[PDB]
Amino acid sequence: GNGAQGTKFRISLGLPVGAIMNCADNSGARNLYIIAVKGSGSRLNRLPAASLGDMVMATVKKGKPELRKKVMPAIVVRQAKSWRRRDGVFLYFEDNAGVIANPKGEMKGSAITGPVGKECADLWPRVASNSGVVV
Amino acid sequence: SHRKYEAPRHGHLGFLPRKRAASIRARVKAFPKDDRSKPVALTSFLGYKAGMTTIVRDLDRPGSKFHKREVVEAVTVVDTPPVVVVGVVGYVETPR
Amino acid sequence: QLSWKDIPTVAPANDLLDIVLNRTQRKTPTVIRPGFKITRIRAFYMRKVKYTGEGFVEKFEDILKGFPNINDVHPFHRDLMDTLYEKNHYKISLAAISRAKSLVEQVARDYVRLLKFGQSLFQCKQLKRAALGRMATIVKKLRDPLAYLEQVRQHIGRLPSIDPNTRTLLICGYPNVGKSSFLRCITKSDVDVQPYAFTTKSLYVGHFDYKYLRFQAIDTPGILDRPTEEMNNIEMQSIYAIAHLRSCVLYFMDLSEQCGFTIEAQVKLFHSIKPLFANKSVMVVINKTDIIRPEDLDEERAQLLESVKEVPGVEIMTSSCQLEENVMEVRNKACEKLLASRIENKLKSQSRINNVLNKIHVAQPQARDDVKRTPFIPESVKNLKKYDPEDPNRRKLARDIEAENGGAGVFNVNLKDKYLLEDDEWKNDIMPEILDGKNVYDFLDPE
Amino acid sequence: PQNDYIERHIKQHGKRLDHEERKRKREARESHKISERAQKLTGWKGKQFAKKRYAEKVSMRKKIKAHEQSKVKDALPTYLLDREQKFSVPLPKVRGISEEEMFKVIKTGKSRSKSWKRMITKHTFVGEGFTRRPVKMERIIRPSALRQKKANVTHPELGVTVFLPILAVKKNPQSPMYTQLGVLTKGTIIEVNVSELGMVTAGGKVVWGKYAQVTNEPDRDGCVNAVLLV
Amino acid sequence: AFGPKAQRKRPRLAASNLEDLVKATNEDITKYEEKQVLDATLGGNQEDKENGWTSAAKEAIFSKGQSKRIWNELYKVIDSSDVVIHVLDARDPLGTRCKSVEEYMKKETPHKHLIYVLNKCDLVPTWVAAAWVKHLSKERPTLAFHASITNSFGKGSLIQLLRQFSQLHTDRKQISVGFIGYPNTGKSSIINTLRKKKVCQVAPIPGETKVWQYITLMKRIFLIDCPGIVPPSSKDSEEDILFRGVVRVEHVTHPEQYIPGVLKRCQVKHLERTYEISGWKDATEFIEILARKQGRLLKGGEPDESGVSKQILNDFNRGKIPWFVLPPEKE
Amino acid sequence: MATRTQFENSNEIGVFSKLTNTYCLVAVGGSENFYSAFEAELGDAIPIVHTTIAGTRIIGRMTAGNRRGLLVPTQTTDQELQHLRNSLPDSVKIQRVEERLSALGNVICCNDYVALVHPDIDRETEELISDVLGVEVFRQTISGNILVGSYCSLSNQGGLVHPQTSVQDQEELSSLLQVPLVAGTVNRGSSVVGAGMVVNDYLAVTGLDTTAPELSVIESIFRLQDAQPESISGNLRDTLIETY
RNA sequence: UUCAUCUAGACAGCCGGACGGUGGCCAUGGAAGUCGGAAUCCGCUAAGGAGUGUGUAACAACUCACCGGCCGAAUGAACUA
RNA sequence: CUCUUAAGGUAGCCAAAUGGAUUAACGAGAUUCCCACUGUCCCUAUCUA
RNA sequence: GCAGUCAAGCGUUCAUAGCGACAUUGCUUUUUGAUUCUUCGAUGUCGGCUCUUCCUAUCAUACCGAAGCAGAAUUCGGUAA
Ligand SMILES: Nc1nc2c(ncn2[C@@H]2O[C@H](COP(=O)(O)OP(=O)(O)OP(=O)(O)O)[C@@H](O)[C@H]2O)c(=O)[nH]1
Ligand SMILES: Nc1nc2c(ncn2[C@@H]2O[C@H](COP(=O)(O)OP(=O)(O)OP(=O)(O)O)[C@@H](O)[C@H]2O)c(=O)[nH]1
Ligand SMILES: [Mg+2]
Ligand SMILES: [Mg+2]
């Protein structure tokens, strides 16, 4: 894991490969298509899967024409699959969403719309600098 | 032919035979080693399992990301009235 | 660019053979019987051929993609490597390896097609051996190029990382003038310091900061008079350094007795290398002046020394390696002279200042009102000492308590004990926060 | 970095405290370890070891004899010095090849029961303007990857071989039918173009075609090797 | 030259004077840097490497017909055929030309004849076709064709030339002629119009014919058709193979990114008459207008983009929108 | 008075810390190296407090205040609210606000006298800000950049805005805030200038890669070391030309 | 088994000598026996190469090839089974 | 040797609207893709006769 | 592979009647890392799921040896399934 601040606890995976999420940043893309998962396991028949606060590789299925045909890194900031916090309570958002980044963890856009999980803003210091709403 | 794809085994071959036990009360197979420079004490007890319940505790763990935070967890309560002593046994040590 | 140190390795022919031909005997099956089907007997040996072909091709690719392609890099490194490794031989050996890479591939391609028509284990085995033998015989002819390239690789991994576009001052002259001593004085680099002519045979680099900027200083082996055709491959490094590098050259002069060369030769050397000073803004320096003080020089030698100041522009100074405090003035003046040209040249662009008018220009308030908004500093800070990281008595620096108690991930800091109550006794207390239902904090208030 | 830094460092501090004695004792243990390795190292690491152990001995004998001899102890022009470099055939009575090998039965039909076709499994010289036959009237297949075009022809004297194209298959032993088909087995007599050797006959003409004999089985390699007939 | 013996001290070849040394180096530095300036604008990927993003893997449907299963039929047809005819597309012949094998046939098989046939000649004007025959008839014969069974053009010219080729080889008992070219140029349709019945299968989809097939006519001349080749040129596009109809457009993934090419190749006046039209710019709007008119609406209620772009590309390749490439001007 | 340190290994000092005129808050995770990097420069002059906001280490982008008060978001628990009230003296009002834009450090960019706010922040919070911090309030972007609190550093001495800011916007913002401004960078060319350093009247701290030409401008514009009176950029002109 | 050394003293060890023309010529920034090239001679001796290795920027220094001193009886090489 | 490339700038002269077979409709014929939809799958668990 | 050169031994003694290890030259296309747009007839069967176990001829993990191995990253080897 390169670019992340510290260790990461385990939360429920809710987005296998082939899933499509939205683009919360204002770079110009409108959605994203997961095709790999940075830092996964390896097991026969298992689909690589991502969870909140993870770094994935994606293409752009719809959006600005300069941003397509290229695979880029993204970070997942909203999950819509109930996970469990340690101040015991389960929760989930209203949709899956992520933002496009660079292999160090820095953002392309300038602002992020809608809530952002603590479990991602605490991991990536530059998402906590561009998010205006946390949780 | 060589399976074309390596994958771990299914199950653990040390917990075999997978047969029913021989009593409702499992037996202790080893005890703490010893030290004759210490007071006499028991090494185990006997209780009865009674359900689970939830807990929150104020965590101290230098280094953890939950140092100085609360965590909710599950616990098991077992019911242990006192135990009464009714006999003593002695064991000789033979080359068998 | 800039210091290719990651060239993988090159083994000689007799060990390249062994590496590849044992890889193909360890990482491919070995047992085959004649009772098996003929398609199996064919496949076995086709594999034995293809694998060794890929082995040799891959050993050659890492050489063809690692070396720095002497043509079209930068006409400074090009000429340096030319004087260092003989550009002709350099290109020839790599073309030899590139040619072997195609020959091997064609052999591998042909003998597979031949194998797919074999009719017995004997004939197929013989074709396998024929192919591997022709490969080995192609390789065994590279005994000389593969031996030259390893030394070139080793020696090019150790070259200094000079940069042509940056801010450079060159230090040249005769043997034994004081140039390496001056580089040692300014920068901090390991340079053999003994008194003879060629104690150095390469260029040496050092760096130093001036006016919040970074500069490099280069130290050259030195030139003789040697009328321009009977010159070593040692003088060529100095000459190409002077010719290719936008810099400031500090010509030293040993107007002295220790190696007190004939001044009528040193000035002739200066005048002979003078064409290299097209736009370099030279600055002659007289070194080892703690025993001469050139004020006491003869009239005709004064005329020799005046014969230099009739060039376009050359400033004169005087210093020594003993009184190492006036020597900073030399490098400060030379840096000023370099920046003089740098800044006017960069202003000449006249589109860079338009876009950097954002970072060199402050914006004033116009003050909009009379309300007083003054900076606020308390007195507990104006009364403060300064933490000296070495003094026997200082502040306690909580990390010291941590490291002494202690440890990084084993010390438990008491979060209380550092705050202010009406009674310092009851600070290690516990707030209840819950009753029957009834959050306590919801009812808790004064009055 | 940047120069011979390890050498400078050795000149300046120097190599170790226990360096020379370590090396001096490795040297002395070498004679024990070499003999211990000759009795271990099973399985092709004994063969690889013994072969070099033998080559080194031979080289030492060569060096010693040369040194020992160093104690006591054809009419070329000025421009050619200072530089460098019966009617029987050599191969009569080669082994015989039956018709069961060198031919290969090829069966046709959806249920393959109509063979009538034969593929040659040796090398051939097909000619100049080949033009394969229709698949329906084709009966003697000669695949396109066994077709040869050149040969490695060597002069008996003159110690040199050249890569010369072929011009015909004059005569193949063990059958005339194979001579017709153009087969290139061992012992075959072929006609090669020898303009690269620059031969001139009495009367001043220029030879450009002669006979050679093939001297290998070119089904166990690719090359066709031949010796000129002079 | 170099090493622990290194019996070389002075360079090559002792340049004549510093006066010209400084000149040569001062020219070479500028010469160097201007090249880098030019290549910067030409094309870069360093910023892609910084932003850490890369390019998607190229699709496999753009790799036919390479793949030796068909290049093993090509050399077999060339081996068996006495005379070869190379078929071109009258819309753009220089792209479907496939030189790349004429060098072969010239080097290894000079006794084979290799004429040109330029068919699909009813999709271009008459002056265009005449100009193309003229400009191509300075290398090979190059006849001009139009292959239908009932209404053809050129059948007699091809027949009475195969008869000449057969008379020349009057001691060979038969001659074979083989048809080669790109996919979807009409190799099978030419055989069908020559013989005047449906002998070999034809279809608008590229990869129709898969193996070679013998067909007799006149008892002394056979015709052989084979699958269509695309030489593996390691350059020149991924989107040129599309517009020289080779790929089955059903398999390309995002077919809307290719429509700017259609707008560039064709004419606005022609494109306005086949759909029919509204006025537009920025081909995204072209597609939106067209789909709204034609009712290609998705599940409520927005238009379909890919489903319409596929049929636009199919209309382009199958001869429903008029277009052609200008022939080389006179001289 | 410019210092260079790090959190665990990150250069974003303003994410894990918050420095005002009278106190300082620092994160909890791992060891007492970051806290000691502040104690080395401030000793016992002002309170330094180990804290979390909502159980997270990012306590710079979630709080907001000056020497008068301190605002926390609505996710802050009662335990940490009480911890802050215990550790800070009685001269500093504390308040938990209930605003949707719950990253108050990203949303507000305040000093002792004036504050810039995100243009969509609402009325109750706009009134609480002026009430507790005793400041003025301006809805305003920074070259069309929402989240003023992270793309700008502020002090009583001067400010610093991200290098894409236009000169006209600089002049206007200077008119508003009554302090000089420049457009620079931090941590070897980063555009989040407010989230990568913490500054006040008499101390500035920034990451371990803030180069010398950046540390110069930071030391000048905030008038840190006596004396750097915001005109020495006249001696800093040539180095800036050569480094830009 | 076949050849050699040997009480006019062997093999293994210690200690001493290891010289003069001469830093022999051509090379070149420097090459003095030891980065290279062509010879490889002369004098004086008991013996001592225009030099077997380590070493220096060049030298110096150590070393064996070859001699002698101390001790005292067997030793070495090649080869076959 | 009795002998062979005419044609010119985004749609051409002619010929009874048309220049067609690139043929509508139909289909327990064969085939490729898209939207929707899902335990096909990640990865299985539970219920009734 | 074919055609030679060499030269320790073997061969009844033997060179030269003969063999003959190890070394070595001839060439299969172009001396300047230029793209080589071969991709040319398998006559008979591979290819892929579910699941065990064995070999080592080791990819990674553990321990070592050598390299211009400064640090970082590598390369070649040893034990080891
Ligand atoms: N006493 C004294 N000697 C000096 C002084 N400066 C130079 N030297 C002499 O310089 C000798 C060493 O050479 P350097 O100073 O490196 O000059 P250099 O030989 O030309 O330098 P390089 O060619 O790069 O190796 C010393 O032995 C000194 O005798 C000085 O200031 N005082
Ligand atoms: N407009 C026009 N279309 C033609 C002409 N000739 C053929 N076509 C069309 O082009 C396509 C040709 O298909 P094929 O004849 O199979 O061409 P091919 O792909 O080279 O032939 P195969 O070897 O069978 O693959 C058919 O759809 C025809 O309708 C023509 O002269 N004019
Ligand atoms: Mg020196
Ligand atoms: Mg086709």
Residue numbers in the entry:
A (entry chain V): 3 to 137
B (entry chain B): 2 to 97
C (entry chain b): 2 to 448
D (entry chain r): 2 to 74, 85 to 96, 117 to 261
E (entry chain m): 140 to 182, 185 to 472
F (entry chain y): 1 to 244
Question: Can I see the authors' text?
Answer:
Assembly of ribosomes requires the transcription, folding, modification, and processing of ribosomal RNA (rRNA), and stable association of ribosomal proteins (RPs) facilitated by trans-acting assembly factors (AFs). The crystal structure of mature yeast ribosomes first revealed that the eukaryotic NPET is composed of rRNA from five out of six domains of 25S rRNA, and the RPs uL4 (rpL4), uL22 (rpL17), and eL39 (rpL39). We found that pre-60S particles lacking the TD of uL4 harbor a misassembled NPET that lacked the densities of eL39 and the Nog1 CTD and are blocked or stalled in at least three different stages of 60S subunit assembly.
The R1 and R2 particles (27% and 12%, respectively) closely resemble Nog2 state 1 particles, containing a prerotated 5S RNP, and thus have progressed beyond the stages represented by the R3 and R4 particles. In classes R1 and R2, no density could be observed for the NPET-occupying RP eL39, the Nog1 CTD, or AF Arx1 that binds to the NPET exit platform. Although class R2 exhibits wild-type rRNA conformations, significant shifts in rRNA helices 68–69 and 74–79 could be seen in class R1. Further analysis of the atomic model of class R1 revealed how a misassembled NPET could cause these rRNA conformational changes. These aberrant shifts begin with a loss of the interaction between the TD of uL4, the Nog1 CTD, and the linker between rRNA helices 73 and 74. H74 is displaced ~4 Å relative to the wild-type conformation, indicating that this portion the NPET is improperly assembled. In this aberrant position, H75 clashes with H68 and displaces it up to ~62 Å toward the 5S rRNA. Specifically, the L1 stalk (H76 and uL1) adopts an unusual, deflected conformation not observed in any previously characterized wild-type particles and H79 is unstructured. Class R2 particles are wild-type-like and likely progress to class R1 particles, which display a shifted rRNA helix H68 (gold) that prevents binding of Sda1 and progression to Nog2 state 2.
